[PDB]
């Protein structure tokens, strides 16, 4: 079921999980949807990724205030690209603590993005170091390796059958991995598979530019990456 607030679209995926969608015209691609998540965790709300712009991100915050009416404690952004970090200033103006891979924060200035306030670091097995992600509630953050970008991270939602692949994962019907300009073509397949292995039971795979899919999205993405 889809709900609308301004230029955004919201779809409920689980009793306490919603997908947020914002659009931007991208040369050679079209009017591209970018998806993120909204998670209600007891008396607070957690956000995964911004919208493409500050104005669109402010609309996510206003929709949370209206439909959920619980304060937004934090946001995790999954890499330093406009569709995931374009709205950082809107989060900061609202007093929301922001987190990103330390590498995302390092790359953010070069990418024309505003860095997150806090940096996440990861173990050699890809799992986030818990001292860098305190009070993340059901969010389980995993760095699968370089793929779509060198800094892309993924998030699993504990207590649900959902795992969010961000821009690393394409749906099971995709014909390419899209723009490979910032991609790691040598490690993409292994990174896609590391994401699948980190959340081995998730049956609903959420991704940035397609509607939620089955685990066939992971298998297919990795098969496409094997040809690179
Ligand atoms: Zn990207
Ligand atoms: Zn993307």
From Swiss-Prot:
It catalyses: a beta-lactam + H2O = a substituted beta-amino acid. The keyword Signal applies. Its EC number is 3.5.2.6. Zn(2+) 2 binds at residues 83, 167, 209. One of its GO terms (cellular component) is periplasmic space. It comes from the Bacteria. Inhibits by captopril, thiorphan, dimercaprol and tiopronin. This enzyme is not susceptible to inactivation by the beta-lactamase-blocking agents clavulanic acid. Zn(2+) 1 binds at residues 79, 81, 148. The keyword Metal-binding applies. Keywords: Antibiotic resistance, Hydrolase, Metal-binding, Periplasm, Plasmid, Signal, Zinc. One of its GO terms (molecular function) is zinc ion binding. Monomer. Belongs to the metallo-beta-lactamase superfamily. Class-B beta-lactamase family. Enterobacteriaceae carrying this gene (identified by PCR) have been isolated in Sweden, India, Pakistan, Bangladesh, England, Scotland, Northern Ireland, Australia and the USA. The organisms they were identified in were K.pneumoniae, Enterobacter cloacae, E.coli, Proteus spp, Citrobacter freundii, Morganella morganii, Providencia spp and Klebsille oxytoca. In India most isolates were from community-acquired infections rather than hospital-acquired infections, indicating the gene is widespread in the environment. Confers resistance to the different beta-lactams antibiotics (penicillin, cephalosporin and carbapenem) via the hydrolysis of the beta-lactam ring. Does not confer resistance to the polymixin colistin or the fluoroquinolone ciprofloxacin. This is Metallo-beta-lactamase type 2. It comes from Klebsiella pneumoniae. The gene is blaNDM-1.
